[PDB]
Each structure stands twice: as structure tokens, then as C-alpha cells.
Amino acid sequence: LDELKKEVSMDDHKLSLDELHNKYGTDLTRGLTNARAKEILARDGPNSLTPPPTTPEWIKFCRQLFGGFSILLWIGAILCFLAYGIQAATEDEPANDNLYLGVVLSTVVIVTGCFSYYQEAKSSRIMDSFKNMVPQQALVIRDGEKSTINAEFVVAGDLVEVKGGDRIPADLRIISAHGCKVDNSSLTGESEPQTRSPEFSSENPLETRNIAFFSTNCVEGTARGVVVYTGDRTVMGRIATLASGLEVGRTPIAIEIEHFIHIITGVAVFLGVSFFILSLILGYSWLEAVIFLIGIIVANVPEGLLATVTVCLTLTAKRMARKNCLVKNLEAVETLGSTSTICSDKTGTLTQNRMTVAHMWFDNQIHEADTTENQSGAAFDKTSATWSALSRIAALCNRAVFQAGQDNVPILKRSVAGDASESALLKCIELCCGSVQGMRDRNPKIVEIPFNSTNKYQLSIHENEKSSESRYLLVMKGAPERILDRCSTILLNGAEEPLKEDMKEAFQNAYLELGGLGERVLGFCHFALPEDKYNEGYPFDADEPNFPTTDLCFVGLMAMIDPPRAAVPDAVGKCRSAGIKVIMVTGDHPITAKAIAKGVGIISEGNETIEDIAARLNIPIGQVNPRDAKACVVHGSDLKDLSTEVLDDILHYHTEIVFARTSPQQKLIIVEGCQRQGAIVAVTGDGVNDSPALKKADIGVAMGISGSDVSKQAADMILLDDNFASIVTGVEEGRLIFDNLKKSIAYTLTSNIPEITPFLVFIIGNVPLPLGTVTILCIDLGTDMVPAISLAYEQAESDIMKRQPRNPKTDKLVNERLISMAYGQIGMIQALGGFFSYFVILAENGFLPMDLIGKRVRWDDRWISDVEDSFGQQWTYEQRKIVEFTCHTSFFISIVVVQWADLIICKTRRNSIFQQGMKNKILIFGLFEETALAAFLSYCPGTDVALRMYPLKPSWWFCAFPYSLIIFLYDEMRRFIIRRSPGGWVEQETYY
Amino acid sequence: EGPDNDERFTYDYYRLRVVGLIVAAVLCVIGIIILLAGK
């Protein structure tokens, strides 16, 4: 469906003005007829974007109500009402058991539904942001007259007019223009104004001057044009549809959840029906056969687990909110940890998005300035008298000014009225020479010639601030070579000197080096005009050369670029040390893209492209073995004629990849290419041209300050302070939460065994029921909750940023090793500790373990109010039941006591508690509150009716203590083996 | 005692409950103290 939109567009900028009118039945001068425009409206439809059909929240909520655990809990809830129905008909049961348990279980499903619904959130308003880029109104020429109309009423063929400050209402063929410049950052991510004129200037319509696009704005001048595309058919309207239309897809974390749901659901249905038939064979009435099944359901399903996961995710997202990293989708909290490839935009993401002075060439020396936002570098020069001469030209031969009321904000961050290069120079001098306004007050400008297309230079004449002179100084800047052809002397370390071929060659060298760094280079020179030839009232003519512009003194060079953000180089290296592949994907030109790649460490030192090898060896590129080149730089124009299989080969064959001059669909294609190889991919960006890529990414991260509204709609995560170091933190947090989820899951599952085994022995042994159904819910929904959550606050056991990204095909959240430990080893020890306390309670009340076998028949018989114990005493029905429920209560408390040790062992997968310590305060809180809850549930009056919880005698609490301790020792010995031999036996069997 | 051994079939479940609830409360307070050591 969207495969059409993933392709490069076709256009009609090649046609003549006249020819273009024939195609759209239009007038170049009079414009369309009121009738013809209305006709075309009904024909083509409105100049608007329609949002894609969404899934209502209704269906979204209910889709969770049927995912494995909820299905089993539904079967339980209904099976409760089943047994209740069968009762209400047969023998009038005045009880509330099956009825209430059926109500409780149905509530558990609904509430669990809210948790998973909260986790599976999708806040997407892509198409809405795009719609915000179409103006409310447009100016059209109809019947030879200009009028403002609803922009939706704009059709292909009419004559539209735009001027500085307004949004392009539709894709236009420029037919007339006067000084028109446009901001195409929507399509390129670059905000430098692009001229628009009627002349065709490139085969590529996205590069030609005679096309203006919807989603962009006119920055200055005026233009008229013929509408060629409207609504969804515009270049960026298609990007809108592509972006808004892209299928979301399941996250890595989501896939893991479903996976263990299958496992646990599997064992649940297995043991469920495996013992349902095992009971009927033993001659159990279907009346009972279902009651046992309900218990089996409740025992096997970890009722509180899915909600635990959600809370652990939420708490991890809260910590990241506190580092200026907003998470829109709870699952995106983990994806960053599983990320193996980052596709990053350059401008406004890796870079500050601001022309900044990078180097200066004066005194036959290359000086480097500090490009960082917060200025974390050092000085270059202050002493040289040459510097002050260059500094003066940079301030004086400059027409840029700071906007009013910025004195509060830092120099480099403040808004400037002017072109990017003049702003850069302004901020450079203001920083290291103080107030520039002061320099422009001490040296009043009397005449100037602003930068001309033809002159290729800008000159200014000022009254020298010096009192002993107060004469006229000439300054000029422009193209380095043009400035050179106008110089005779060079200000070396203070004093001038003739411009010999020697210094002239050093100039060329300096010029070539700076240009090689992808930096824009300017020349600077001045000339102190002779006093006798220029009186204090001498008039200078700016129109006609009234003053010399030759034999001037060359002062120096200055170079500039849109530099990396301070934290970016280090963040890139850190991603790469964690084994994450970092690719650059930018709408910017290749020379600039490549230079920043080396600056931030995308391309490491020494690595070459095929073009680099060819130039170094002075040989044809076809003569170069492409396998000798680990780095590559792909232009979008070449990308366009490559198949995906060939794109896949590029991705496979290079470690250091730069995709430059890419369109928005091309970014999507590169992302998909990476994913196709089985990689989890993150995208980082800030422009509307990142929207499709951000949507398709497993996780999209947008910049918060510099980011466009669209990009932040398309993302899963926002960096609110533009701190790229947050990606590094995000991946670290993502890995940590992945491990801690394992700990929390194992902990929760472990207590399933002591809830399953009592029901089994109840059938096979014919003893009184050791633990009840209600009692199980008091564990999974009550006591285990805070402890399970607390594992989310566990510190790393080792340097997680030192390991490679997990293999999502092999490294699962829940594997066989977890089940073996939780179900086969620790849970089994917990089961016994439960049974022990059960036998203790009964034996101390007169029913010794031996006489318990095959007694349930008489025990449950409501009409036998005289059962004989081991000592020959006789018990009524309600009397023995009180002891039985007291057994449920102590078995319950036994679970809590054995979960103490389990909580401590689940703390660490490898390390010892004596190494990791007990610095998790939430965990300790869990221990205290868990025990408080259990005690309250046993001793609070009335709980014997609502939950069948009975007061325990002090000695009862200590039954499971020896089992709780064996768990601690056992797991500590086991992990001691793991560490002592990384070989594999204990490791490959039990290492979560 | 002999025929007056009524205490043999008696248990102070009332005191046990009072003590049990005291303990539960104090464990609840102790927990808050340790948690609130930083919030």
C-alpha cells in the first residue's frame, strides 16, 4: 500500500511556463476562472490531508482481556459460576464461595486489563502535525484579481502568490519571483534559505529552484507560481500519509511478554487437564472435578505478574523523566537497551544546528576556536596584535545584531537577525572580545557596500576609534581567493609586510585544510586610508568606486561549520563500546556529512571509503577492491537507483556508514534495511524529514528543544534538553530493567509451586486441603507485590555497557533456566516448608501425619460432627475446619517466610549478596510491609470471615525458617559455583 | 489441677491478637522509617 510512497517523486519543472499551463488549463496572468476553480475542486477534491482510520479505544482495551492469563482466569471465573449454578439447583448451598470467587476473578481480569492497556499505549498524532503546516488561507489570482481564499479551496492550475512570512499552500511551479528565498528544512532538515526563481536549475525537482513545496515557508521576497499538486498528492503530503500510515508493530519487550505467557499458559493447561482426568479416574464427582480445576487455574496463573512488569517499567520511566528524558510509550523504556543499530540524523541531532566559527588563519598559523554550546574547550590566542585586527573586521564588517531582550541567555544560544555566517562571526567576537555593539559605537560606520553576488565581497568604512588618528579605516570580507587578489601586505604578528609567494602558498595550504574539514572559509582584510588623501569630511561613494579596493592588507582567514553538540562525540563512542552500530542518515550535502562523521566518531581515524583509496593511490575507483574500504558515503541520488538487496550488501559490508542527501522515504528505507538483517534499530532526529524513519524505528527518539512538532509526534521518547548523552543512559537503563525483570519474574513464579503442590497432594493423598484458593490471591495480589516490584531498583551486577546487545532470537526474558530454578529447585523447597507447617498445626491439635492419609472423605463430611483424631478425641464439623483454615493461614505465612530468602536470592543472578549488599531500600521496605500485611491478615478481627485467615500462635511463624535458610544457602552455594567456573554446567543450567 | 483443670482447654487468643497487631504496626512503622531515608 505504502510501497508507492517509499519511492522518489516525478515532476514537471522541466516544462516551459506556457507548456505547464496547457497541462492544467490555466492562465499565467489572469489565473483560473471562479467557475473553473470550483469545477476542479469537485473533480480533484480539497487541498487537505485526511487522517488515517484509527482503532477505537474500546477494541484496544478488550483485546488485552484475552491474552493467555486472562483467558485462563476467565475459564476459572466462569467455572466458579458453573459450580455455583450446579449447587443452587441441587443442594441449596447458602454459602457464597463460588459466586464471590467468580466475582473476584472477573475483577482481577478487568484490572489486569487496565495495566496492559496502559503499557500498550500509542500516542500518535502525525497527520495532525502535518495539517498544521497548511495555512488557513492562500492568495490566488482568479479572473485577473488577487483574493484570499480558504487554502483547502486551492486546486491544481490556479495562480498563487507568496511573500516573506507565509507558508507554501501547495506544491507550486514558480513562474515569477523577486528575491524569493525559501526554508526547505522540511525536506532536507537544513534551514538555510534557498532561492526560488522561474528558471529550471536541476534535473532533480527536490533541488531545482522553480519548484516550491507544501510544508515549507517563504523567508523573504515574493513569488508567483502555478499549483501542480494539492493535498495528499503533494510531495510532503505523501510523506505525511507514509508516516501516519506505517504499521506500528510489536516492541521487543512486548514479544518477550507474550513468549513467557505461552510457556506458563502451556504448563497451566497441561497440569490443569492432566489432573482433571487424573481425578475422574480416582472417582471424583464432576461437582468436585471442576472445583479442583479452578484451584489449579489460580495456582498456575501468576495473577500479579503482568501488573508488576508495568509498574517496574513505569518506575524506570520516572527515573528517566528526572534526567530530561520523556517516555511517551512505556515499552520504549526497554527497546533502547536492546538496540543494536542507531540511525541518526545530523543537523539539530548530532549537531547544534548553528553556524559557528571553528578555525582562524592568521600569523601563518591555524588556530582552533571552541565550538561547544557551554564552551567546554580552551582559548586559542588573545595576545597577537593580528588577532585584534581580524577581530575588528569580524565585528565591523558585519550587519548582524542580537534580538532585543536576550541579555539573560548565553551568547551562543541567543537569536540573531542575520544570515548564518554573520551570526557566527558576531557570536565569535562577542564571546572573546566582549560587547560587539561597543566596537560598532567606537568605530562609526560612514559608508558600506553590502555583499554582492558579483563583487563576492563586503566592504565598510569606519571612523577609527583611536583619538590620535580618528581617521578612516576600510574593512572587507569575502571569498578567500577574491580577498587575496586585493592584497599587497600581510599583518604578521602586528607589523605589515609584502605578500611574497611564500605566504601566498601557506594561504592556499591553510585554505585547503580548512575546506577539507567541511568548513566554510572566509577571507578578511583591511586598509588604513592615507590621511592627507582623505579629510575628516571626505565623502565616500558606495555606488561608484570612490576609494581604492586593491593593494589592501590581508589580515586572516576564518572558517565555520554547524558543529557537533558537546556530548555527541563521547556518546557515540560509548554506544560503539556497547557494540551498537552507529549510522548517519542526513538530508545534508556529503562533504559536510562526512566531516561531522569523523568529528563525532561515526568514521574512526584511518578508515577509508573507496574514493579515499582511489585519491591516495591516484588510481581509478573501479581499480579499488571495495572490500578494502570499511567506511562508505552514499549520496541519495545513487541510493535511488539501488535495489534493497544492494542496500543490504552496503549495510553488511561496512562498519562506518554515512547516508547523505537522503530524502525522508530514503531514511525509512535505510531503517527497514537494518531491520531486515534482524537488528533492533533506534532512530534519533529532530526534523519533519525524520518522521517516517522515527515511526518505523523500533524506538524513535526526538530532540525536545530543537525538534519539530512532527518529529516529536513520531517518536517514542523525547530528549527535553537535547542532551545526546541521554541515549547512553537510556541504553544502560534499558539493559538494567531487562535483567531486573528476570529477577522479578523468577521471584513471582517461584511461589507458584507451593500453591500448586497442595492441590495435587489433596487429590493423590486424600488429606485435608492444605491451602485455599482465596489464600493464593492473598499472596500473588497481596504479599508478593511490593517485593516483586522492588527488584526493579537493583543496581547492575557488572558493567552492562561492556557487553554486546542481546540477541533477540536467542536471549529471552524467560527461558528454560528460569523455570528450572523457580519451579524445579527453589519453589520445590518452598512447597515443603508449606507442608511442614501444615503437618505441625494438625499434629499439635491431635491429628498426627500418619492418620491424615485418606481422611478428607470424613473430614469434609458436613454431617459427621465427631471425627476421631489420633488421640481418640471427637471433633465437630466447624471445629476441625477452624484448624484447617489455621493450616491455610500458616501455609500462607510459610510462603511469606520462604519468600524472604527468595527475595534476597533473586536480588542477584551471579553475584553474592555479600558482594552486592543490601542497599536497595525499596526491597527492605517490601520485606517489612509484606510481613506487616501477613500479620494484619492473620490477627485482624473479622478476617476469619472475609478471607478465612486465623490467628497464628507465635511458634507457628517459625515453622518455615529452616527452609527459608536452606534456600539462602543453596542459592549462595550455587552462584559461588557459577563464579568459580565460567565454564558452563551450573551456568548453562540455572543462570537465568 | 485435678477436676479443676479448666485452663488446659483454654487459650488467650485475645492477648495474642493484641500482641500480634502491636507487632504488625511496629513493623509497619519501622518499614516507613527505612524507606523514608531518602524517599
Next chain:
Amino acid sequence: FLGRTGSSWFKIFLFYLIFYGCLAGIFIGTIQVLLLTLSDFEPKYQDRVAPPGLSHAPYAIKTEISFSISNPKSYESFVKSMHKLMDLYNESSQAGNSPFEDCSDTPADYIKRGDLDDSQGQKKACRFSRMWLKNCGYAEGKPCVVAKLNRIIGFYPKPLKNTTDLPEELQANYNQYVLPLRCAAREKIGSIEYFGLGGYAGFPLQYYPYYGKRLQKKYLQPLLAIQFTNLTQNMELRIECKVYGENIDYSEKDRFRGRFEVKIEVKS
């Protein structure tokens, strides 16, 4: 295979065999020590049987014994259980001076055979003739229910003293030696008739205290036969038999705590 190789499948079996073996051996060990802390003659706790329960022979479907006099197999169900109990009180079962003893044919005081020790043989229990149960196949019309006080080791059932007012106000009040049992329903549409030891409507105190199964096997607890020769027919009559005493109490939950709940209906 599914998971691993044969070598791995073996090792996982050798482990869980030794592992579960140890766990079973430990579990058994903790059961040993538990038993080691317990007496053979007396249970550690008795507060959960404390107030004695009162149970009868007619096995009630739901605290009810409804049947038809004009039908044979209508009551043959209740006669099965009635027979089961009384069959134990046979004279052929009580033979010789061992381990039985002839005790007062009239309600007497308690009998202490020492302590709960094995320092003596089987503590000798009082004989009880089912022949003390006058009038009661059994009552084919108007049932002859048999009451019973639940056995508790070392329990001395103490009758109420005639200090103040009483339900069966002072009638045949053998204050010193009889634990009374008065059945009731207002709703007085019956005819209560009690049979027992010495002809009294109670339990003779000479059968106490019970020394337990280990120290007193073949021991016989006193019975109290109750006959309802009611002149009514074809209606549910809620009859409650209550025992009175210093050590006797009741509960709204446990409807068998020192009392009966019988729903007789001679629907004939």
C-alpha cells in the same frame, strides 16, 4: 531431543534424583523431631475441642431425619447407623475383670486412675449396658434417637449447681453427679422421653475423665437414649437437645457445640 543431548538429559536426572532425595530426607527429619516433641498419651493442645460436642447416631442428611412409618425401607437407612453404634455396647464385648469394671448402677462421682502415664496397664473403664437404654429394629414410628458427649482426654464434665433458676427447674436434680440433657422445640407438639444410666436424663460422672485411646482402649462412653412419641404427624419439627454444665458452652456457628439440631418428620 527437546531440550538437550542424552549426556545432558542424564546429568539433569542424576541431579534431581539426588536433590529430591535429600529434600525428602530433610522433610522426614523435621517430621521426626516434631513427633519427638509430642506425648503418646495426650495432645499438645486441646483448646479446639474444648467445649464438648454433642453428636447422635441417626445419620442426618442435613441435621434432619424424615421418613414414612407406613414404609419399610423409609427408615432402614437410619437403623443402619443406630445399629452401628449400639453394636459396640454389647455385653460380649465387655467380658472379664479386664479391662472392664462394674461401676455404680446409679450416677456417681469421677474416677481417677492416676496420671496420663504408662506406669500402669490399660486404665480400667466402666461397663455400660445397652439394656439401660429402655425401649431401644428400632422405633419404626416416632424415633428413639441416641445422644452422645464427645470424648476429651482429662475432661471433667461439671453439672450446674441448683443455686438459682434452671430450665427443667429442680426436677430430679441429681446436682452432684448428673450432666443433664433436655430437648426442646412454643411449638410444643411432641412428647419427650429420656432413657439412660440409673434412669436419669444425663451422663453418669463415673465415666470420667477419659484417659485416651492409648491408655484406655475398648473404653465406653455413656449414652442417653431419647424417644419422641409425638402425637403429631406430617410436619417438620425442629427439635434441639441441649446439655447443661459449667464446662459446657455453645456457638452460633458450630451448631453441634454441646447441642443437637434434629428435623424429625414422620410423613406417614
